[PDB]
mmCIF file of C-alpha atoms in Angstrom:
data_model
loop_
_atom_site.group_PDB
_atom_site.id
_atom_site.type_symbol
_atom_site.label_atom_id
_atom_site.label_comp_id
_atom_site.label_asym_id
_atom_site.label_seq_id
_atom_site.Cartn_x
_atom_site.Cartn_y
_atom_site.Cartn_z
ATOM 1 C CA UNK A 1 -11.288 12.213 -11.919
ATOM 2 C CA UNK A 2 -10.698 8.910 -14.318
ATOM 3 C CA UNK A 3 -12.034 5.768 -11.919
ATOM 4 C CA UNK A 4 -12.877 2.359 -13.211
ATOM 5 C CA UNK A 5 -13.831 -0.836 -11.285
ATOM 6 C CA UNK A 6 -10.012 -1.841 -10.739
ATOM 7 C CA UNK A 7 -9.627 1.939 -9.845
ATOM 8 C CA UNK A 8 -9.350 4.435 -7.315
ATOM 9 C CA UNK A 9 -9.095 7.803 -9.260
ATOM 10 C CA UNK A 10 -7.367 10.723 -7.137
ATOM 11 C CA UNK A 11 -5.960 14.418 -7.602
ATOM 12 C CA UNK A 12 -7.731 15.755 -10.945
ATOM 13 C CA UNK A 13 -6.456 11.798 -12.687
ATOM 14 C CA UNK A 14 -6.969 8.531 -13.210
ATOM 15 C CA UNK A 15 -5.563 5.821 -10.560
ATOM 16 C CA UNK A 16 -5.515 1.969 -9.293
ATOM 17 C CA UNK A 17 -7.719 0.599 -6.947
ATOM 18 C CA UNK A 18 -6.481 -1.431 -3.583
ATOM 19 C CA UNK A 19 -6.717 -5.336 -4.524
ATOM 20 C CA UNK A 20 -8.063 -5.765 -0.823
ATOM 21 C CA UNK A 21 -10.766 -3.157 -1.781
ATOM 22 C CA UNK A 22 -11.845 -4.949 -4.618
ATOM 23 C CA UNK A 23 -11.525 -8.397 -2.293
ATOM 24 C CA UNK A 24 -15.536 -8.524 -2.388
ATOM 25 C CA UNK A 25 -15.977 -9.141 -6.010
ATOM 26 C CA UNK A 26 -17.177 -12.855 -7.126
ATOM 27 C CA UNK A 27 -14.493 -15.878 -6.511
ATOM 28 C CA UNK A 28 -13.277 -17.728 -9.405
ATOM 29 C CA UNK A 29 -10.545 -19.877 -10.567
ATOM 30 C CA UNK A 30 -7.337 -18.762 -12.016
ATOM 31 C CA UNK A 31 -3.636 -19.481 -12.414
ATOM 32 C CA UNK A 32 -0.145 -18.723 -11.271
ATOM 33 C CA UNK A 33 2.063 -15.329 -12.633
ATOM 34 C CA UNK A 34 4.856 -16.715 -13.979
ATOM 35 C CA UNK A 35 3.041 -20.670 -13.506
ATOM 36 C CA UNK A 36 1.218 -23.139 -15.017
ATOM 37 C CA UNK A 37 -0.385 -24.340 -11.229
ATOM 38 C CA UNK A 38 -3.961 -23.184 -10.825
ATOM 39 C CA UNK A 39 -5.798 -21.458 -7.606
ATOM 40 C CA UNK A 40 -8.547 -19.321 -6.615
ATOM 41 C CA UNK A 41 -9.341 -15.693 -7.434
ATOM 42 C CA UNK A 42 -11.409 -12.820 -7.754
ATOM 43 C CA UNK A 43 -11.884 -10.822 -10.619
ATOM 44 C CA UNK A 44 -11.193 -7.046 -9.056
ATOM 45 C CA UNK A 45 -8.231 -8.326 -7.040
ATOM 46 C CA UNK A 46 -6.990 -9.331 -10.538
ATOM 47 C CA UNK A 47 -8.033 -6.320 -12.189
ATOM 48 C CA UNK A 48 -6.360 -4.230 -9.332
ATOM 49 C CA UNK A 49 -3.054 -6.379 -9.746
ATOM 50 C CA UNK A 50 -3.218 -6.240 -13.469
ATOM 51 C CA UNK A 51 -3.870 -2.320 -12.997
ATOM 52 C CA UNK A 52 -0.307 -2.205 -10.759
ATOM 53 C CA UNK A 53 1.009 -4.402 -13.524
ATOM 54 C CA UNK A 54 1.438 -7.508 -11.499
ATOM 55 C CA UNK A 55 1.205 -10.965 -13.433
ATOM 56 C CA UNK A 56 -1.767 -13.292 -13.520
ATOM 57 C CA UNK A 57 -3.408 -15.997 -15.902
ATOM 58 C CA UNK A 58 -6.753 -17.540 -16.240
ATOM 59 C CA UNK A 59 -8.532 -20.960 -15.738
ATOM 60 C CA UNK A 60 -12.001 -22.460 -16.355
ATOM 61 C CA UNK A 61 -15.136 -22.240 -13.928
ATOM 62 C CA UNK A 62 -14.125 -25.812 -12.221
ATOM 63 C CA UNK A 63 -10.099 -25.213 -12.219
ATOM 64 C CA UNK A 64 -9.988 -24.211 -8.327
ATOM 65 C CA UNK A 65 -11.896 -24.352 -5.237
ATOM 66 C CA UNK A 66 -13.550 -20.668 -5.356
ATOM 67 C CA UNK A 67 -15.978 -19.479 -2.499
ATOM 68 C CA UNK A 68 -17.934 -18.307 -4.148
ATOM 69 C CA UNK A 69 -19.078 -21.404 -6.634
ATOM 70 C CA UNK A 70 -22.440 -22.526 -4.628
ATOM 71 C CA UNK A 71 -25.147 -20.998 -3.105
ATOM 72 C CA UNK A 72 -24.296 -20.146 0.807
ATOM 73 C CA UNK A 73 -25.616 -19.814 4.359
ATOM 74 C CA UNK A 74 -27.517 -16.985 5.968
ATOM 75 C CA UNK A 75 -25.308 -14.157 7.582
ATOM 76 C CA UNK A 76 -22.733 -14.509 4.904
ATOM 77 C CA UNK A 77 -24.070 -14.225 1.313
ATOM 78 C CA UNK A 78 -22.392 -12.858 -2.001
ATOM 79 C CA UNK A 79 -23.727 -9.558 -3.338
ATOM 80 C CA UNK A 80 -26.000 -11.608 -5.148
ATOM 81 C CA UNK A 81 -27.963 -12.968 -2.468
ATOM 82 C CA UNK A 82 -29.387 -12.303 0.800
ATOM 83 C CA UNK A 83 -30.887 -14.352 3.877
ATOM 84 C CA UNK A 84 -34.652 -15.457 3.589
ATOM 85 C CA UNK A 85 -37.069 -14.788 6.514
ATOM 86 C CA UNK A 86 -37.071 -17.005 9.728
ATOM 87 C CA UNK A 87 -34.675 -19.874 7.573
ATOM 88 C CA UNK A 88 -31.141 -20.468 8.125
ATOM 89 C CA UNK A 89 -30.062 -20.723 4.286
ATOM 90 C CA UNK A 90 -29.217 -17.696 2.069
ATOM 91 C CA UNK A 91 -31.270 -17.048 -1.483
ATOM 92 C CA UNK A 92 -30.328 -15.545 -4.757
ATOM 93 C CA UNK A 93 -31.619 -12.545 -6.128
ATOM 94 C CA UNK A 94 -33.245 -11.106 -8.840
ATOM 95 C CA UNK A 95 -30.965 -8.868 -11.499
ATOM 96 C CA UNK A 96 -32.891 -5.826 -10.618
ATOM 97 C CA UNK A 97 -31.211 -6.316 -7.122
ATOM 98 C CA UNK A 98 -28.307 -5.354 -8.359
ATOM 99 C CA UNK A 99 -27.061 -2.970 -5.158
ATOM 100 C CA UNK A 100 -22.943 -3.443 -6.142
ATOM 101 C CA UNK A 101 -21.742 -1.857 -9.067
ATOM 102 C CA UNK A 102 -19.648 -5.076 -10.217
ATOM 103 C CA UNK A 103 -17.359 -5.856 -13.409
ATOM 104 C CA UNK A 104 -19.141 -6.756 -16.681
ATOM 105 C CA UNK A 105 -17.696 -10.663 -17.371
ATOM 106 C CA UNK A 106 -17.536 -13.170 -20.578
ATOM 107 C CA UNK A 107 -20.022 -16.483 -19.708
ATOM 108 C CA UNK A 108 -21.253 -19.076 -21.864
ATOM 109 C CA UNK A 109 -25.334 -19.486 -21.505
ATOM 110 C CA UNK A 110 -27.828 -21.397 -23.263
ATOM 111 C CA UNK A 111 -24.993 -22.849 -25.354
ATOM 112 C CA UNK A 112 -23.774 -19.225 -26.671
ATOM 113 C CA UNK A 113 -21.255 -17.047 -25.214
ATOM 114 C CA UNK A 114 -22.568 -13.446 -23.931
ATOM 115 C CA UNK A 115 -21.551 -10.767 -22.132
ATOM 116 C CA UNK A 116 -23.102 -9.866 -18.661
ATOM 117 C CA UNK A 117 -23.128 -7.928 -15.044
ATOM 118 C CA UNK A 118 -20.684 -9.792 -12.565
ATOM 119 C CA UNK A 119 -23.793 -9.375 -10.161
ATOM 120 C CA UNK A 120 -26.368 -11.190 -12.824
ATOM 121 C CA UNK A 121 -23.751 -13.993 -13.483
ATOM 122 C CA UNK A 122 -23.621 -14.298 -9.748
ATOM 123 C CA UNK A 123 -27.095 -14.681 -9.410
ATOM 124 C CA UNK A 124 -27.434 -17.203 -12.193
ATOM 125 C CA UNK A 125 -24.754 -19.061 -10.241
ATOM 126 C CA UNK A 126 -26.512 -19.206 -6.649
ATOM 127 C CA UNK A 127 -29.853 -20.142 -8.251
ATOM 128 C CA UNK A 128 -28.309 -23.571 -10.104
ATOM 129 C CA UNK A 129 -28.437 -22.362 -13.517
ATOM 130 C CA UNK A 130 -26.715 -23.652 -16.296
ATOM 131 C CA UNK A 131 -23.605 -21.368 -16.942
ATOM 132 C CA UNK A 132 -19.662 -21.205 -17.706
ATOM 133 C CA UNK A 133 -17.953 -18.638 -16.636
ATOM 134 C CA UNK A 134 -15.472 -18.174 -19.995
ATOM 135 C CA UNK A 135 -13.195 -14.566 -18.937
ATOM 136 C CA UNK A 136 -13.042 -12.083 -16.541
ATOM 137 C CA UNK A 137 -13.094 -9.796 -19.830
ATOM 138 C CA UNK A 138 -16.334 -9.334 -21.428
ATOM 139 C CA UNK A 139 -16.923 -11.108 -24.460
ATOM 140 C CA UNK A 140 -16.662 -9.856 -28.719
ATOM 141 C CA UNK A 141 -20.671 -10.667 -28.651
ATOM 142 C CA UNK A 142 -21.270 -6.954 -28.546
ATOM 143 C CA UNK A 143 -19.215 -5.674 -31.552
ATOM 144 C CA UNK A 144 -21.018 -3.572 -34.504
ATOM 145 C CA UNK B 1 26.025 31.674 23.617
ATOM 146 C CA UNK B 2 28.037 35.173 22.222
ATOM 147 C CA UNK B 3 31.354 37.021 21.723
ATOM 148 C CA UNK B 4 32.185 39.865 20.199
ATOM 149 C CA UNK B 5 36.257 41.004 18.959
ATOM 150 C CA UNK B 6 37.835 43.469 21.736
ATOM 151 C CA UNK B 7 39.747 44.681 18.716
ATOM 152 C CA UNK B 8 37.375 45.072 16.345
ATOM 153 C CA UNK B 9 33.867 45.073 18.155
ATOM 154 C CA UNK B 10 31.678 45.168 15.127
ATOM 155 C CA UNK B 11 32.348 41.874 14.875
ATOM 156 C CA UNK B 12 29.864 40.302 16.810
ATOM 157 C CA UNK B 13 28.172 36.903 16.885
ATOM 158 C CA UNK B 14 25.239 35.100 18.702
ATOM 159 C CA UNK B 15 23.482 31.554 19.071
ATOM 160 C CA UNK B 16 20.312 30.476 21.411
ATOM 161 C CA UNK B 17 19.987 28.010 23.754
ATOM 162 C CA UNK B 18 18.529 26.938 27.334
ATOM 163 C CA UNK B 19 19.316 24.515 30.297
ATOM 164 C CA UNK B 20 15.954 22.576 29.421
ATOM 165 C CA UNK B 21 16.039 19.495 27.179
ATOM 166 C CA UNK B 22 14.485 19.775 24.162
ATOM 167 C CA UNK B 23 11.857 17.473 22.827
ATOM 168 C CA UNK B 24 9.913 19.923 19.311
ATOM 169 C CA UNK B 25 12.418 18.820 16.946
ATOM 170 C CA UNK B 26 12.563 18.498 12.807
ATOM 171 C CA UNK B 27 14.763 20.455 10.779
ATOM 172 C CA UNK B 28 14.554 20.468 6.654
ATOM 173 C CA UNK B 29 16.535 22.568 3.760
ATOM 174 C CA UNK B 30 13.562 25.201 3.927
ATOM 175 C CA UNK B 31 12.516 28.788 5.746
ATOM 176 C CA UNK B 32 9.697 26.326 7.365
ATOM 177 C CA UNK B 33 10.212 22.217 8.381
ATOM 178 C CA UNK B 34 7.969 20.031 10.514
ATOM 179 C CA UNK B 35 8.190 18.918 13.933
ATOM 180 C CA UNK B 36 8.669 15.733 16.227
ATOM 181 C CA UNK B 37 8.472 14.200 18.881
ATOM 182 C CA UNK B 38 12.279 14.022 19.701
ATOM 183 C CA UNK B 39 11.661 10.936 17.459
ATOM 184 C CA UNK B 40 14.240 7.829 17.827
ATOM 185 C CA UNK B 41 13.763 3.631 17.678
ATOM 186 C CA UNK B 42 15.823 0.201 16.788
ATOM 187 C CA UNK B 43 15.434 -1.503 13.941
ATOM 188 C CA UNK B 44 14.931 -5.580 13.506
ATOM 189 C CA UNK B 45 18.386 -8.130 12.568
ATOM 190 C CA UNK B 46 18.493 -8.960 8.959
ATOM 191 C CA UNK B 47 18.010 -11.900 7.578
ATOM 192 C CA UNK B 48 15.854 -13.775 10.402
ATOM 193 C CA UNK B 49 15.181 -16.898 10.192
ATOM 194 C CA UNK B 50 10.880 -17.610 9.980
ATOM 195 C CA UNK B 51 10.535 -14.447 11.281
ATOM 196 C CA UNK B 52 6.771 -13.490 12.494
ATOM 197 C CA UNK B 53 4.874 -12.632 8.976
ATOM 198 C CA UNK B 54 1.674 -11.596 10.607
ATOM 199 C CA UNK B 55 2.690 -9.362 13.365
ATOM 200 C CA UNK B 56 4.023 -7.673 10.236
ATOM 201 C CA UNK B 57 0.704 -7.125 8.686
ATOM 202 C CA UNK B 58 -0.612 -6.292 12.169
ATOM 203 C CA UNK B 59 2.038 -3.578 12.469
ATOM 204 C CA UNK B 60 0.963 -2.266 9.030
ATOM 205 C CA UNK B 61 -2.739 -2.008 9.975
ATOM 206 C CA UNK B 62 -1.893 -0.293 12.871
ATOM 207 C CA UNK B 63 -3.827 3.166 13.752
ATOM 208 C CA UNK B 64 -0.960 5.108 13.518
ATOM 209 C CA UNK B 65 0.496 3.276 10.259
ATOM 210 C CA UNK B 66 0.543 5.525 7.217
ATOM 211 C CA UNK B 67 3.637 4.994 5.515
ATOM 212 C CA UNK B 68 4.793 1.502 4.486
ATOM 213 C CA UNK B 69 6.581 0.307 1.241
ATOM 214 C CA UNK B 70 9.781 -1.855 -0.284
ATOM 215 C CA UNK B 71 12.764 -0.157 -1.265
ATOM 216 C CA UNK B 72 16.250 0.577 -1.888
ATOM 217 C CA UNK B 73 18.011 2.842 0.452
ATOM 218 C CA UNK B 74 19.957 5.557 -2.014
ATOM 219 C CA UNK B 75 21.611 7.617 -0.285
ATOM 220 C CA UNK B 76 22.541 9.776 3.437
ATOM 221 C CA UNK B 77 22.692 13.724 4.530
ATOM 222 C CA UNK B 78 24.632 15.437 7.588
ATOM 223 C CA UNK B 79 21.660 17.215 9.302
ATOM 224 C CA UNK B 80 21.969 15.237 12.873
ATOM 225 C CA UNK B 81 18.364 15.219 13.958
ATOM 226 C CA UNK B 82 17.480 14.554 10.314
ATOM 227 C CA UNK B 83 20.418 12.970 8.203
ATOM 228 C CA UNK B 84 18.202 12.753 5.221
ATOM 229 C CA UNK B 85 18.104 8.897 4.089
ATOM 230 C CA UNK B 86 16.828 9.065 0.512
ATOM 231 C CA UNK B 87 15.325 5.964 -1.712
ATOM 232 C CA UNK B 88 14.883 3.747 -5.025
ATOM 233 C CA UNK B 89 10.803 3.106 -4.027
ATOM 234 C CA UNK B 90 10.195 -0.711 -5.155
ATOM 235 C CA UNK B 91 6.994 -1.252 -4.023
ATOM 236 C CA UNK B 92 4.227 0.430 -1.753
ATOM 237 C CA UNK B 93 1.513 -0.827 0.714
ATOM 238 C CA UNK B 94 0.118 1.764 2.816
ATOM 239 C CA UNK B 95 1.796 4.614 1.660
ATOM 240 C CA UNK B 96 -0.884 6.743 2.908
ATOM 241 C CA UNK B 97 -2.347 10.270 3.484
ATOM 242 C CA UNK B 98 -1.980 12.462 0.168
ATOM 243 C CA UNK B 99 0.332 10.229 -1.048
ATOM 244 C CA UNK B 100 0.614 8.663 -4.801
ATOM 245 C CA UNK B 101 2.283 6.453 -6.949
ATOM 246 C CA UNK B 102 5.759 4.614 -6.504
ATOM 247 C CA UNK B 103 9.170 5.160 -7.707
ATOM 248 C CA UNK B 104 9.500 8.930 -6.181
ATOM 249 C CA UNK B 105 12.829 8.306 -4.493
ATOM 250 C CA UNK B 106 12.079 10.430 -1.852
ATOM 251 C CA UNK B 107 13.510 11.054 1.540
ATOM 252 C CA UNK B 108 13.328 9.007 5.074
ATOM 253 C CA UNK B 109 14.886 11.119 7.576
ATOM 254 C CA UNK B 110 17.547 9.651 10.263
ATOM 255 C CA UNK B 111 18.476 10.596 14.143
ATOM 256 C CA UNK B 112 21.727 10.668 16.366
ATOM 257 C CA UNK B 113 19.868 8.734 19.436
ATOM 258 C CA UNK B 114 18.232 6.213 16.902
ATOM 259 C CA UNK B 115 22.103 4.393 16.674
ATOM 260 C CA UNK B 116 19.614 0.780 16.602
ATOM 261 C CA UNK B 117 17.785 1.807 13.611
ATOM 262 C CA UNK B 118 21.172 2.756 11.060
ATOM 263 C CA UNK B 119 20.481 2.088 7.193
ATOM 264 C CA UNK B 120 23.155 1.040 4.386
ATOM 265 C CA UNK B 121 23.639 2.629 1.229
ATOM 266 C CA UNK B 122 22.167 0.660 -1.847
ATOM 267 C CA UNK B 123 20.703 -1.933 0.473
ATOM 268 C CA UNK B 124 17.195 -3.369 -0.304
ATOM 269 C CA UNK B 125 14.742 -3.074 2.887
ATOM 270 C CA UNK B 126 11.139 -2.904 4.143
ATOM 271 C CA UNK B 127 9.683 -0.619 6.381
ATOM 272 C CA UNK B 128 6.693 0.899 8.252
ATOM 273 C CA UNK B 129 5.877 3.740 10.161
ATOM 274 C CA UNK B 130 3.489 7.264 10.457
ATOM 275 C CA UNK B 131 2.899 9.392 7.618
ATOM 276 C CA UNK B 132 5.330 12.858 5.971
ATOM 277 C CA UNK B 133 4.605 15.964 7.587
ATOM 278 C CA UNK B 134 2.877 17.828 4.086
ATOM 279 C CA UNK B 135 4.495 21.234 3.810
ATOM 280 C CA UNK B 136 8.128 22.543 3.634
ATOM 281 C CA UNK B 137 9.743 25.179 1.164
ATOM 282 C CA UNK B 138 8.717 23.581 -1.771
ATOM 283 C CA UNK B 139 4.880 23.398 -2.632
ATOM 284 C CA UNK B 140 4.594 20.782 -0.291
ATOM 285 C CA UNK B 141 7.196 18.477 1.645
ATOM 286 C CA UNK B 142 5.362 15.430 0.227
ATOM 287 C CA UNK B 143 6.531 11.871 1.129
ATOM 288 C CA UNK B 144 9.436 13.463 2.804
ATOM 289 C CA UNK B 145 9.339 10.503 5.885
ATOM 290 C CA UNK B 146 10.088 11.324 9.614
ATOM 291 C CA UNK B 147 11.321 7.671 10.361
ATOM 292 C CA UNK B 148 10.073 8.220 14.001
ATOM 293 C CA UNK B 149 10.071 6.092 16.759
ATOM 294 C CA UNK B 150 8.620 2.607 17.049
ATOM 295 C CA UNK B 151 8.776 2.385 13.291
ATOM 296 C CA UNK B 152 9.503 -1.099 11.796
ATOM 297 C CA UNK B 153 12.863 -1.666 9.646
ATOM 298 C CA UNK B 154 14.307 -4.732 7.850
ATOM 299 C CA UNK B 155 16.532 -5.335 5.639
ATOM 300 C CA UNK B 156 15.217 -7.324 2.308
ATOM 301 C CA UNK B 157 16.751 -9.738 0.187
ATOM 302 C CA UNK B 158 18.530 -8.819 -2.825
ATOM 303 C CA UNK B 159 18.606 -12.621 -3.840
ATOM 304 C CA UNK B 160 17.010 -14.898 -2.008
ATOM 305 C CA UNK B 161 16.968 -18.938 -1.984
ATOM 306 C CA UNK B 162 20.995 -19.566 -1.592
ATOM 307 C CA UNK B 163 21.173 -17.228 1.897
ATOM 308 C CA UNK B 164 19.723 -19.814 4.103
ATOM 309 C CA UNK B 165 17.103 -19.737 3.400
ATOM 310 C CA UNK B 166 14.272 -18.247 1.070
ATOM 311 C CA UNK B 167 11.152 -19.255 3.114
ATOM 312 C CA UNK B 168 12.250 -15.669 5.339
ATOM 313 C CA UNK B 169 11.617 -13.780 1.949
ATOM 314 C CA UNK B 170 8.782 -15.867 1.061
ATOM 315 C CA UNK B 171 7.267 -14.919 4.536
ATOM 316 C CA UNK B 172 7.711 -11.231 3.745
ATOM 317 C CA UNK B 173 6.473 -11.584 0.180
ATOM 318 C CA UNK B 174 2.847 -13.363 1.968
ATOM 319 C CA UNK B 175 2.734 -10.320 4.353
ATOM 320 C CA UNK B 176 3.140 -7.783 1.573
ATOM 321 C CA UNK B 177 0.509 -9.784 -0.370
ATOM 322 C CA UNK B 178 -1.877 -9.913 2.792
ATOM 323 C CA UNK B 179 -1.513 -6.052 3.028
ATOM 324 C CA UNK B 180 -2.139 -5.749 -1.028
ATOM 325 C CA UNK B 181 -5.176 -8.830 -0.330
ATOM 326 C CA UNK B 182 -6.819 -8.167 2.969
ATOM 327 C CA UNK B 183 -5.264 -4.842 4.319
ATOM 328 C CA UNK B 184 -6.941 -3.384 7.600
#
């Protein structure tokens, strides 16, 4: 049956996912339904809104106070990170450590706008690289 | 119960009963229906004021919770221990155990003793409760909803901010979202 990462496919088809199921994806900023007032967000609970055809708009990678937008503490870390041995502060991992399945997300690097895993980005992120997190929606980059 | 006509005593008729009370109970339009537990509740006031938003989404995440959604109640049947209740589905939450997508219109059965728990006809409302009972008749009895005991009913706001006041339907709106958001 037809899933996706917003989705939750069931009975020979295609279906939605729960937004609270997709509550552990990566936090971001975003913006109100039918408002011009910004707030956090995450992009599967937006996906899985969007999916049940629920309103939403979005808003650049300082717009709201997101989670998710620094490197945290041991016994609580992002899907892109994990606690290091004996030490009380949580590290960021490698892309090959890519356990979750994730979205694939639009993010400005280097200067240049590029697609990439929502896990990847994420580690980027924790580790204090220079990114910009651009759309929830991949980028064109990849057209042919 | 029986009698038969002295003056024409082909004419014969018979019911069953028995002195015991009776507590397996569901009845459907079908050669095979379900069963309950002599199933009956009360329903919460409309309207209330800051009502508790939370114990809401703690009644929704409940163990036995398997049917919950926001609706418009259609229309009524005459069956006593199951006076049909049919819908206009709205929205859904935790609609539950081979269940699917909204806007089926289906059934929420009704009982004599439940007199606290009585619905109005094109009224907007929000409920919770235990999941359909799968197989009737048909090729299954799908979303066809007991309304059983201890269920939750309220009645929702058709428009809100003039009824004194729209913070009561703002408070149901965040415990819909938290059961959308968080769930259990």
């Amino acid at each position: 049956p037809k899933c996706q990462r917003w989705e939750k496919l069931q009975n020979s088809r295609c279906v939605c996912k729960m937004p609270y199921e997709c509550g552990p994806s990566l936090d971001v900023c975003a913006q109100d339904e039918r408002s011009k007032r910004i707030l956090p967000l995450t992009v599967c609970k937006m996906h899985v809104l969007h999916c049940q055809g629920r309103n939403y708009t979005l808003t650049g990678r300082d717009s709201c106070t997101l989670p998710a937008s620094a490197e945290k503490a041991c016994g609580a870390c992002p899907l892109w990170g994990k606690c290091d041995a004996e030490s009380s502060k949580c590290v960021c991992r490698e892309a090959s450590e890519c356990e979750e399945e994730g979205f694939s997300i639009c993010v400005e690097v280097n200067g240049k706008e590029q697609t990439m895993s929502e896990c990847e980005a994420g580690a980027l992120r924790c580790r204090g690289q220079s990114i910009s997190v651009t759309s929830i929606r991949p980028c064109a980059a990849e057209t042919q | 119960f029986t009698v038969y006509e002295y003056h024409r005593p082909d004419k014969q008729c018979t019911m069953f009963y028995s002195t015991s009370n009776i507590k397996i109970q569901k009845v459907c339009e079908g050669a095979a229906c379900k069963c309950v537990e002599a199933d009956c509740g009360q329903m919460q006031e409309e309207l209330d004021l800051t009502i508790s938003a939370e114990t809401r989404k703690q009644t929704a995440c409940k163990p036995e919770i398997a049917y919950a959604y926001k609706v418009s109640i259609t229309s009524i049947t005459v069956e006593n221990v199951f006076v049909k209740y049919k819908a206009t589905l709205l929205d859904i939450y935790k609609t539950g155990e081979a269940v699917a997508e909204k806007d089926s219109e289906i059934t929420f059965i009704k009982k004599v003793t439940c007199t606290n728990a009585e619905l109005v006809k094109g009224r907007q409302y929000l409920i919770m409760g235990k999941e359909a009972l799968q197989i009737k008749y048909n090729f299954s009895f799908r979303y066809i909803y007991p309304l059983d005991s201890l269920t939750w009913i309220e009645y929702w706001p058709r428009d809100t901010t003039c009824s004194s006041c729209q913070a009561f339907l703002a408070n149901l709106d965040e415990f819909a979202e938290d059961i959308f958001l968080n769930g259990c």
